[PDB]
Amino acid sequence: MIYSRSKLPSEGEILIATVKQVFDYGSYVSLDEYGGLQAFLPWSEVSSKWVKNIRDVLKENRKVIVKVIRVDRRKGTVDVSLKKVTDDERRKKNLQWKKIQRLDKILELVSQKLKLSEKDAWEQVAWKLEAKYGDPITAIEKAVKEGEKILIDAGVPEIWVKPLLEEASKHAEERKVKMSGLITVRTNEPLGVEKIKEVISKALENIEQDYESLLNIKIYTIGAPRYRVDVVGTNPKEASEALNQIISNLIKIGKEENVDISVVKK
Amino acid sequence: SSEKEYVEMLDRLYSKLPEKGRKEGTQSLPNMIILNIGNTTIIRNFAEYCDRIRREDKICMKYLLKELAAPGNVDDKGELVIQGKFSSQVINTLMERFLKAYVECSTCKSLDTILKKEKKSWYIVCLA
Amino acid sequence: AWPKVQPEVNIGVVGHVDHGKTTLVQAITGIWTSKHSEELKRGMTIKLGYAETNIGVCESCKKPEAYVTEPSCKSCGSDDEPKFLRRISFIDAPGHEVLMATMLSGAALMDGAILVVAANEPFPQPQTREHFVALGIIGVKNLIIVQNKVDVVSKEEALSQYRQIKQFTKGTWAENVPIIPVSALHKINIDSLIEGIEEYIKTPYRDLSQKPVMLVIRSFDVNKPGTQFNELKGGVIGGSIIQGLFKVDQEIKVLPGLRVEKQGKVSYEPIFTKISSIRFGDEEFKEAKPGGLVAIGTYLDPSLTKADNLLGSIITLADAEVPVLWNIRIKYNLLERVVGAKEMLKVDPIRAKETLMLSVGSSTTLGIVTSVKKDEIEVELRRPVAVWSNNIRTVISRQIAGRWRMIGWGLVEI
């Protein structure tokens, strides 16, 4: 399961919870992100006056996305909305959720591995990363590319980071796919190859920073006038997107230094 | 440094010619295969020409001379004990199959470069 | 042992006997010009028979045996170390269809010649008699006629086999040209031929203060398929520097260059680039001089060389003042009967508006005739050939650079 350093959520936040019992007034639910922090969903925040049947709309153990709109720091009282929740955060919280499930599993792995527990794994990894650079799920994919400095620059206690990086790099290489375009470069200059290498570098410069997903890129030569571009990352859009941004920059920066570069029309 | 008197340089050739008189070829008596027609055929003298090239030559004599599924090497005398795919009386077989693959005879006879139409480390990694 | 130098002399191998001329090379150098380990070593550098070997002398010893090639004094039979003289190179000239079409590049590509005899036949051959005078046409006065394939012959096969040559020599220019009997297969009496090369084919004067001029006979892409952009190397332009002095990190230019359509009119504009590396055979030097086939790495887009594209053209320095001319004035020449494999008397004359192949260095330009005199011919070349200072011996023909269709020659009045 998922634990949380903050026992009580912030107001307006979008979370995820699994129905436990849709009995009386509304429906009682449990936020799986706080360990099972028992929340609550008033019937008035389901749908509309569209002839409501909360008996089936919310079924036992059906995980759904809500939004906290009521918080009392006495006992609990965590009233949440359903359809009055921003239905674009529908894709938002759903996607982050995928990454949170990922984090849990990889956390469970490393933790169950050595003499750790889910209690300690979060308490020493996710917690400390939360206090460094936003959500850990994204700061972890950052560490695997930069090194082991990322986790010590968060507070992580010494030499159990490596198990994390060894196990995290596992899941990333599993979900490997490649998007590759085709170009042709033919420039005639005093130092042609020097320009060819220089312009490709100008285009590629600062692309992995904006497009966060990729692991590595290779613009190697295939023929003599034609060259291949390879992008390998863990995201469909990111790959095909970054790939085109590269190629567009190749053409744009190309004519700036008199380097003819065109995308193969095949 | 000579005109018509260059004969003594040409004599240097016909004097270094007896330095290369009878080398490249066959001498004292070639085929040692005898006339046998039993089940297949086995030479009574194959375990003497073996050392009259170099060593055991299992990956040479028996290795090269073998057709299909040819059983049997040389522990006694001869080979091809059963099914040699070479059951005959051809006294001339050990001459053409070893006309390139000798051991050690290239295209000079004295002393040369010993093994040098049939190689393998000439293509994998250039040694020379 | 001896210093690591570059070839300073180019020797031409001219014969007719199959492999006879070829084996004679390996007899001196030892480099196989049949099945090569040159294509299997780098990329695809394979045109003519290019061999090279050092030449030293085991002084304090008799001859012909002191003159050795390797630092091992095992030829003279001694545990000593000779003096170094020079490194020489040879050209088998197999190529592609060429049986004479190679010797039209100049003189710095072949500073000396060795005419290897055939073997059983009386004297001349379909090739021997053909390109014999081809040495007295392009400019080779220092020649060595060798009596090879005498592997199995007699003294009587020299009492007239050698005296037959003295007749063929008496009637032209090459009179007292040496005739050395050498063993084809066996490396015997080769010492004599070596001593011969060292006497009758000396190292011509090299003026290293003139405009650097290399004749490009090859060019290609050295990079392998898959090479990352960070490890891409420039184009390779292996030619034969005919004069001047080329160094690494020097600025050059490829003439004539490229075609440029510029509002009605087209021209050929140079290709300025830098010298990355120099490579004589397999050893990397820092400067190249005339004599010896040199491979020059550059900073050019491999798409310009790759498929031997940059073949034909020549290379100078960025600053050159070199006239790359369309039309040219050519003083043609009256050659006899010409095509040894058909065989006639005179030949088809040179008319106006006729298409002919002018082999300028290694260029196959087709220029329609425009003017005809007695010793002058104005041409309408397709590609603007480049001239540096002196007139070029372009062996005119018709079709392409090959044995098929040969006719006349002549310089290039400039």
Per domain, the residue ranges of chain C are: 1-206, 207-321, 322-414
Is A264 within 8 Å of A257 (Cβ atoms)? no
- Return left, alpha or beta for A51; rule: phi > 0 is left, psi -120 to 50 is alpha, else beta: left
For C207-321, the fitting CATH number among 3.40.50.970, 2.40.30.10, 2.40.50.320, 3.40.50.1100 is 2.40.30.10
Cα–Cα dist A176/A230, whole Å? 13
- Choose the mutation target among C231, C253, C259, C301 for the interface with A, i.e. most A CBs under 10 Å: C301
For residue C307, give the chain A residue with the closest CA: A224
Q: Does B123 touch chain C (CB under 8 A)?
A: yes
Cα–Cα dist A75/A39, whole Å? 11
Give the pair of three-digit tokens for residue A28.
Answer: 């009682």
Using CB atoms, which chains have 3+ pairs under 8 A with C?
A, B
CA Rg value for chain B:
20
Nearest to A32 by CA among A54, A61, A57, A2: A2
Q: Is C22 annotated as a binding residue?
A: yes
Judge: A188–C271 Cβ closer than 8 Å, yes or no: yes
Please calculate the CA angle A92-A93-A94 and round it to the nearest 5 degrees: 90
**Going by C-beta distance under 8 Å and a sequence separation of 6 or more, which residues neighbour residue A6?**
none
Q: Which long-range contacts (CB under 8 A, 24 or more apart) does C332-339 make?
A: C332/C375, C332/C377, C332/C396, C332/C408, C332/C409, C332/C410, C333/C408, C333/C409, C333/C410, C334/C408, C335/C407, C335/C408, C335/C409, C338/C406, C338/C407, C339/C406
Q: Does A257 touch chain C (CB under 8 A)?
A: no
One DSSP character per residue, C298-355 reads ESS-TTTTTBTTT-S-EEEESS----EESS-B----------TTT--SS-----TT-E
Across the strands, what pairs with A59? none
Q: Min CA distance, C181 vs chain B (Å)?
A: 6
CATH of domain C322-414: 2.40.30.10
Cα–Cα dist A144/C145, whole Å? 74
| H helix intervals, C7-143 | 20-28, 135-138
Nearest to B23 by CA among B100, B79, B106, B87: B106
> What percent helix, strand, coil does chain A show, rounded to 5?
40, 20, 40
Judge: C300–A192 Cβ closer than 8 Å, yes or no: yes
Q: Which amino acid is at A217?
A: I
Residue C382's CB is within 10 A of a number of other CB atoms, namely 15
The H or E element spanning position C287 is: strand C287-288
Judge: B19–C188 Cβ closer than 8 Å, yes or no: yes
| H helix intervals, A17-67 | 54-57
Judge: C225–A223 Cβ closer than 8 Å, yes or no: yes
Tell me the C-alpha to C-alpha distance, in Å, between residue C247 and each of A153, C3, C289, C314, C316.
52, 19, 9, 16, 12
Judge: A225–C273 Cβ closer than 8 Å, yes or no: no
Cis upstream peptide for A190 (omega within 30°): no
Judge: B126–C192 Cβ closer than 8 Å, yes or no: no
Residues in chain B within 8 Å Cβ distance of C189:
9, 12-13, 16
Q: Does B108 touch chain C (CB under 8 A)?
A: yes
Question: Is A176-264 a domain of CATH 3.30.2180.10?
Answer: no
Q: Is C183 annotated as a binding residue?
A: yes
Q: Does A260 touch chain C (CB under 8 A)?
A: no
Cα–Cα dist B46/B42, whole Å? 9
Assign a CATH topology to domain A14-82: OB fold (Dihydrolipoamide Acetyltransferase, E2P) (2.40.50)
Among candidates B3, B108, B123 on the partner chain, residue whose Cβ is nearest the Cβ of C40: B123
Give the C-side interface with B, CB within 8 Å. 37, 40-41, 64, 150, 155, 158, 162, 176, 179-183, 185-186, 188-189, 192, 199
Please calculate the CA angle B81-B83-B84 and round it to the nearest 5 degrees: 70
Nearest to A220 by CA among C77, C133, C223, C163: C223
Our answer on whether B and C touch (3+ beta-carbon pairs < 8 Å) is yes
Q: Min CA distance, C231 vs chain A (Å)?
A: 9
HSE-up (13 A, CA, CB side) for residue C129: 15
Q: If DSSP codes are grouped into helix, strand and coil, which group holds residue C154?
A: coil
Cα–Cα dist B42/B36, whole Å? 7
For C1-206, the fitting CATH number among 3.30.360.10, 3.40.50.300, 3.30.565.10, 3.40.50.1400 is 3.40.50.300
Is A228 within 8 Å of A222 (Cβ atoms)? yes
Strand order in the sheet with A28-31: A37-38, A28-31, A14-21, A63-68, A80-81
> What percent helix, strand, coil does chain C show, rounded to 5?
10, 30, 60
- Choose the mutation target among A198, A221, A246, A253 for the interface with C, i.e. most C CBs under 10 Å: A221
Cα–Cα dist A261/C96, whole Å? 36
Cα–Cα dist B24/C233, whole Å? 49
DSSP state of A10: P
Q: Does B20 touch chain C (CB under 8 A)?
A: yes
Cis upstream peptide for C64 (omega within 30°): yes
Among candidates C162, C185, C189 on the partner chain, residue whose Cβ is nearest the Cβ of B108: C185
Judge: C301–A222 Cβ closer than 8 Å, yes or no: no
Judge: A218–C225 Cβ closer than 8 Å, yes or no: no
Q: Does A185 touch chain C (CB under 8 A)?
A: yes
Give the pair of three-digit tokens for residue A259.
Answer: 């380097």
Nearest to C285 by CA among C273, C297, C301: C297
The 10 Å CB-count burial string (b at 16+, else e) for C267-306 is: ebbbbbbbbbbbbbbeeebeebbbbbbbbbbbbbbbbbbb
Its sign, for the CA torsion C404, C409, C413, C414, is positive
CATH of domain A83-175: 1.10.150.190
A126 burial (CB, 10 Å; 0-12 / 13-18 / 19+) is: buried
**Going by C-beta distance under 8 Å and a sequence separation of 6 or more, which residues neighbour residue C276?**
C233, C234, C248, C296, C297, C298, C299
Cα–Cα dist C378/C33, whole Å? 41
Judge: C304–A188 Cβ closer than 8 Å, yes or no: yes
Is C201 within 8 Å of C9 (Cβ atoms)? yes
Cα–Cα dist A94/C100, whole Å? 79
Residues in chain C within 8 Å Cβ distance of B9:
64, 180-181, 189, 192
Q: Min CA distance, C301 vs chain A (Å)?
A: 5
Q: Min CA distance, B9 vs chain C (Å)?
A: 8
Residues in chain C within 8 Å Cβ distance of A227:
229
Do domains C1-206 and C322-414 share one topology? The answer is no
